[PDB]
Design a protein around this ligand. Structure first.
Ligand SMILES: *[C@@H]1O[C@H](CO)[C@@H](O)[C@H](O)[C@H]1NC(C)=O
Ligand SMILES: *[C@@H]1O[C@H](CO)[C@@H](O)[C@H](O)[C@H]1NC(C)=O
Ligand SMILES: *[C@@H]1O[C@H](CO)[C@@H](O)[C@H](O)[C@H]1NC(C)=O
Ligand SMILES: *[C@@H]1O[C@H](CO)[C@@H](O)[C@H](O)[C@H]1NC(C)=O
Ligand SMILES: *[C@@H]1O[C@H](CO)[C@@H](O)[C@H](O)[C@H]1NC(C)=O
Length: 1170
């Protein structure tokens, strides 16, 4: 019979480890039994590999799910197709297949470091937590890699085993590391997960400035008030001078500013009148934010501290906002929204304002006819109130306006979905907070009588629930799989085949069925007191990790710890954006969160860590741990997590606070580092919390490592002690001029004695040497790739200057197995379909082929990217063949242009010379290009370009004829593969004469050096010698100066010249520069330089492409009385192994490598000069 028969829905995505569940519904016109088969196909390269299959039989009137088996996590980005085929017992019913979008996120990985800021020579304690999508533990093998900001692999662990998902590890930082954002990269299966943590020095300011202003402001206010509070670290007020600069941020107009200079004693209040910010609307006209900067300078020290803030300006007396409104119009269905009105200064609204009515105007327009209605509305003390009104069925666009005492606001809805029957259904919820496991209600409202609704719940791009509801009222119980956001899609059919549906996107609060509770023995405890921390876990055989850290981590509001916010962020990262299709309303409401439907029904400050506990409980649901409160006096905060096999993950509901406090103590705001021989100020704050002011004697213990200048009251020891009076419930500061006289970690001990109580604190101070820092670096390549030799000895030496600061010398030696190449994904991003004109084609083509060559010579290929790039440059070769002329010339538009370009001809000639090993290139084309390029040869060997390059970045590359000649010969050098008879000796002599004349520009010199080095001219060695004399080497960083990018091209050509002359060891600093010109932006800027840089790197890889490495590097000599041994193999080839050597003048070492392959050894010397 005619009418609806079936409706099957599926999610549009595919996720490894995600269960592809499809929903099936058969309503009236189906047969008794229908067998639905779901198939997953991996069609790639015309290989329709059917991977996963499922089948299920369903009855009439049954709304059910068919679940495919989970895809394994080892899968990668492949073209995946889902086929659904519903059949009867004797005939087909439907069969269709579609594409599925691939999501790379399959599992959750948390990196939990104890803090986000680390000093040098501190211990980074971290935890790796691997979890399934459903938060069960995930046992797997993984690699951990800790790298410095310069991306040197400084530490690694390989093939670590996750015991119930938790891997607790430590990493000891060096004494003098590279300050910046260190990275922890965890490799699981084939995916990488990152976590950045910063390393820096304290550098404390002695006073801090806080600028209290209202965030929002209006012109009508007479007094725009604000406060500046400059306060010391110990609470004493600061006397000084403040300069206040008020500047509008209207950058279109002038940058005129208001300057106010006056004095401050701790705190000072300022007020602005209306005549000062008039110019803000005279410079430009709605008012935007304005920047207020305060510069506070102390009168006695002159230390200037600058603090900036932004203040928004509002054009109205009050500000009005709307929320809880549907973005799509639903006619004939009461519209509801919520309005909040608040004051311009941000203060609470007055009772007087509550008496005034808000005028709300609604305009429903059929965009023929329109209806404008007004409604009086009230406002509560909080200001939040709901507004409700019906929508006329003919409304096509709604405009809402709110007015209140001159304060205006407005909004509009233009989106509309067309129902031929004019039937709509609104889905709503009353629960403002939805949790997992707690049932929540749901409302459906409709202008017509409703049938038995069918509801389906989707989350994480997976259809997680289905069912049928007979009422217009129903409650649902969310589960863990529903989080973080859930689409509830309700629908029902009509007799004419119309399908009427509605969505509701609800956030779901997550609560774990596994629970952890921490209890302190005492809420308040004295320092150095034994305190028992009790942990309670719901289920035994659980692994727990507890972190107890200072409260300044919460003050930072940015940390690496496993908090509820981090889990929510991971869950929102699990989510994906919706996909656009064929735009029809009944399909669009389904596509709102990516559901693909088939049916017939459509016809017609520095923190410190205390506890890093990690315990694998065996049989106990609770345990106790006796710990010691540190001497630091603070409010420790403890949190933790539990992982169990059955329940999964559980988190502490709240942190637990232990206030380590005593009523009388000592504080030192010591600096991170001081310079020896300098008289620095030591401030000691004696804090007293007794009920009486106390006379306290502060004693500084004498030591040989440092001295105290001013004598003390006693004569037995000079500068030994002072005495002061500390007020009750207050801190008193005392000063001491201390001159260090020793390097390294000096102890400083301070003892406060009073009749009531006493205390003593000992601390470390890192005293460094004075002078100006200097660094020297020398690299050497030990090349045991050749099997003829098996040992290689080198000598690295350096002599310190006579004026070196004694004790400031540090000698490091590092060994590495390979240089740092670009990341594979970063280069893969540059692969693209070459389109546009000939120049755009070449721009989008050349990086692809050069990256392919570099990857081939590095042996890190992936088949899918290989075939993608092969198809891409095959199409690019065809497109360039379309742009090839009859004479072999090439141009952007081919024959449309009047004359081809010899420079572009040489570029494309080099391109096919590079492409010849990868595809078949017609040799007649190559000979045509060769003849056309030879036709431009003059008697003296110089060349000339008749063409013109449209693109400026290619046209702008040193248009002088010398570079043109160098480019054509450096393109023609590769024609020796097919035949070596290339007569360019006259051109080589011309270039030699030009070099003899002396060349000023760096890039011309680089191309010259490459040209004469390729042909083995005798002058090429000398040219390279005066090229590297022009190089600028400072601290193992070699590059070249620019005339005004060009630097990369000169560097790459110099590196290629170095390789061609077998001076491989000298190119290492240039290579490091090439390695440091990619980490800043991923790949390489532009496209002209990427080709030469990747060519140089590929040539380097090819020169020592041995796949096996077993090198042992022994460092001996006067600086190394013990032989320092490094082992380099295929596992730790990238590991920047390091060692420290003793100080001896001259500093010289033998480095003897034995084995097979190649290694790079670098000696670094850091010292200080006077
Ligand atoms: C997928 O389904 C299989 C069997 O139907 C089940 O064992 C597995 O737990 C499911 N996957 C998830 C993530 O729930
Ligand atoms: C699915 O395939 C069937 C069978 O060819 C066809 O009738 C139907 O129009 C297709 N639907 C879509 C959305 O491609
Ligand atoms: C507010 O409603 C009152 C009656 O409750 C009426 O006097 C007043 O005119 C309304 N305000 C406006 C602006 O129409
Ligand atoms: C719709 O809104 C109007 C105005 O607030 C109210 O009078 C009416 O009772 C509401 N009724 C429905 C159907 O929600
Ligand atoms: C290195 O080895 C050579 C081998 O003869 C030896 O003479 C020399 O003293 C060693 N040390 C240095 C610094 O060259």
């Amino acid at each position: 019979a005619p009418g609806p028969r079936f409706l099957v829905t599926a999610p549009g995505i595919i996720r490894p480890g995600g269960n592809v569940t499809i929903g099936v519904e058969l309503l009236e016109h189906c047969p008794s039994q229908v067998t639905v088969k779901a198939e997953l196909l991996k069609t790639a390269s015309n290989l329709t590999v059917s991977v996963l299959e499922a089948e299920g039989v369903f009855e009439k009137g049954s709304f059910k799910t068919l679940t495919l088996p989970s895809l394994p996590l080892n899968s990668a980005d492949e073209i995946y197709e889902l086929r659904v085929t519903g059949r009867t017992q004797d005939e087909i019913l439907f069969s269709n297949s579609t594409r599925l979008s691939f999501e790379t996120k399959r599992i959750s990985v948390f990196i939990q470091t104890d803090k986000a800021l680390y000093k040098p020579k501190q211990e980074v304690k971290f935890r790796i937590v691997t979890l399934f999508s459903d938060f069960k533990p995930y046992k797997t093998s993984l690699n951990i890699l800790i790298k410095d900001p310069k991306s040197n692999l400084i530490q690694q662990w390989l093939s670590q085993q996750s015991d119930l998902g938790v891997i607790s590890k430590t990493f000891q930082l060096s004494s003098h590391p590279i300050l910046g954002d260190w990275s922890i990269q965890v490799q699981v299966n084939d995916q990488t997960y990152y976590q950045s943590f910063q390393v820096s020095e304290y550098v404390l300011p002695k006073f801090e400035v806080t600028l209290q202003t209202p965030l929002y402001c209006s012109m009508n206010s007479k007094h725009l008030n604000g406060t500046i509070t400059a306060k010391y670290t110990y609470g004493k007020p600061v006397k000084g001078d403040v300069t206040l600069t008020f500047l509008p941020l209207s950058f279109w107009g002038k940058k005129k500013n208001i300057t106010k200079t006056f004095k401050i004693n701790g705190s000072a209040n300022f007020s602005f009148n209306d005549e000062e910010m008039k110019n803000v609307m005279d410079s430009s006209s709605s008012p935007g934010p304005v920047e207020i900067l305060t510069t506070v300078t102390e009168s006695v020290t002159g230390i200037s501290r600058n603090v900036s803030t932004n203040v928004f300006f509002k054009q109205h007396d009050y500000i009005i906002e709307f929320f809880d409104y549907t973005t799509v119009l639903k006619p004939s269905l009461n519209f509801t929204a919520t309005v909040k009105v608040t004051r311009a200064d941000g203060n609470q609204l007055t009772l007087e304002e509550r008496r005034n009515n808000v005028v709300i105007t609604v305009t429903q327009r059929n965009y023929k006819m329109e209806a404008v209605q007004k409604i009086n509305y009230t406002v509560p003390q909080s200001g939040t109130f709901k507004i409700e009104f019906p929508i006329l069925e003919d409304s096509s666009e709604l405009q809402l306006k709110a007015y209140f005492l001159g304060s205006k606001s407005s909004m509009a809805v233009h989106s509309l979905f067309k129902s031929p029957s004019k039937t709509y259904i609104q889905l709503k919820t009353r629960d403002e907070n939805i949790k997992v496991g707690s049932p929540f209600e749901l409302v459906v409202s409709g202008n017509k009588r409703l049938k038995e609704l069918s509801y389906m719940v989707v989350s994480r791009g997976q259809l997680v629930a289905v069912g049928k509801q007979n009422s217009t009222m129903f409650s649902l119980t969310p589960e863990n799989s529903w989080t973080p956001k859930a689409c509830v899609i309700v629908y029902y059919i009509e007799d004419d085949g119309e399908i009427i549906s509605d969505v509701l996107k609800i956030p779901v609060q997550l609560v774990f069925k596994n629970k952890i509770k921490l209890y302190w023995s005492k809420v308040k405890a004295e320092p150095s007191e034994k305190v028992s921390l009790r942990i309670s876990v719901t289920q035994p055989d659980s692994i727990v990790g507890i972190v107890a850290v200072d409260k300044s981590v919460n003050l930072m509001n940015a940390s690496n710890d496993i908090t509820m916010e981090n889990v929510v962020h991971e869950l929102e990262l699990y989510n994906t954006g919706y996909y656009l299709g064929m735009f029809m309303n009944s399909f669009a409401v389904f596509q709102e969160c990516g559901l693909w439907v088939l049916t017939d029904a459509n016809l017609t400050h520095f923190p410190e860590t205390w506890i890093w506990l990690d315990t694998n409980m065996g049989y106990r649901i609770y345990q106790e741990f006796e710990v010691t409160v540190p001497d630091s006096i603070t409010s420790w905060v403890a949190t933790g997590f539990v992982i169990s096999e059955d329940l999964g993950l559980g988190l502490t509901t709240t942190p637990v606070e232990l206030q380590a406090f005593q009523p009388f103590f000592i504080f030192l705001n010591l600096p991170y580092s001081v310079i020896r021989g300098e008289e620095f100020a030591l401030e000691i704050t004696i804090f007293n919390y007794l009920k009486d002011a106390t006379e306290v004697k502060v004693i500084i213990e004498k030591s040989d490592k440092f001295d105290i200048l001013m004598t003390s009251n006693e004569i037995n020891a000079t500068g030994h002690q002072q005495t002061l009076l500390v007020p009750s419930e207050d801190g008193a500061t005392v000063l001491f001029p201390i001159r260090p006289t020793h390097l390294g970690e000096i102890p400083i001990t301070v003892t406060a004695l009073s009749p009531t109580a006493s205390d003593a604190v000992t601390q470390m101070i890192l005293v460094k040497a004075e002078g100006i820092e200097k660094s020297y670096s020398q690299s050497i390549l030990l090349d045991l790739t050749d099997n003829r030799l098996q040992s290689t000895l080198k000598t690295l030496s350096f002599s310190f200057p006579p004026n070196t600061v004694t004790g400031s010398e540090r000698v490091q030696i590092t060994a590495i197995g390979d240089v740092l190449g670009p990341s594979i994904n970063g280069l893969a991003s540059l692969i693209r379909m070459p389109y546009g004109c000939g120049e755009q084609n070449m721009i989008n083509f050349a990086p692809n082929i050069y990256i392919l060559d570099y990857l081939t010579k590095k042996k890190q290929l992936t088949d899918n990217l290989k075939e993608k790039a092969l198809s891409f440059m095959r199409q690019g070769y065809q497109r360039e063949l379309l742009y090839q002329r009859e004479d072999g010339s090439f141009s952007a538009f081919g024959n449309y242009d009047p004359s081809g370009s010899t420079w572009l001809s040489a570029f494309v000639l080099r391109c096919f010379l590079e492409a010849d090993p990868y595809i078949d290139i017609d040799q007649n084309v190559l000979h045509r290009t060769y003849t056309w390029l030879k036709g431009h040869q003059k008697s003296n060997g110089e060349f000339w370009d008749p063409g013109r390059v449209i693109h400026s970045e290619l046209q702008g590359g040193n248009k002088s004829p010398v570079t043109l000649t160098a480019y054509i010969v450096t393109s023609l050098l590769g024609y020796r593969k097919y035949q070596p008879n290339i007569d360019v000796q006259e051109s080589i002599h011309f270039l030699e004469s030009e070099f003899s004349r002396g060349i000023s520009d760096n890039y011309t010199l680089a191309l010259i050096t490459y040209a004469l080095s390729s042909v083995g001219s005798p002058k090429a060695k000398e040219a390279l010698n005066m090229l590297t004399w022009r190089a600028e080497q400072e601290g193992g960083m070699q590059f070249w100066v620019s005339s005004e990018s060009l630097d990369i091209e000169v560097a790459a050509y110099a590196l290629l010249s170095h390789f061609l002359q077998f001076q491989t060891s000298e190119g290492i600093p240039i290579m490091r520069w090439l390695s440091r010109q990619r980490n800043s932006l991923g790949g390489f800027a532009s496209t002209q330089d990427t080709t030469v840089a990747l060519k140089a790197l590929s040539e380097f890889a090819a020169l020592m492409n041995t796949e096996r490495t077993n090198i042992q590097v022994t460092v001996t000599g006067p600086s190394s009385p013990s032989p320092v041994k490094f082992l380099i193999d295929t596992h730790n080839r990238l590991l920047l192994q390091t060692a420290e050597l003793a100080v001896v003048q001259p500093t010289a070492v033998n480095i003897s490598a034995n084995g097979f392959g190649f290694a790079i050894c670098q000696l670094n010397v850091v010292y200080n000069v006077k």
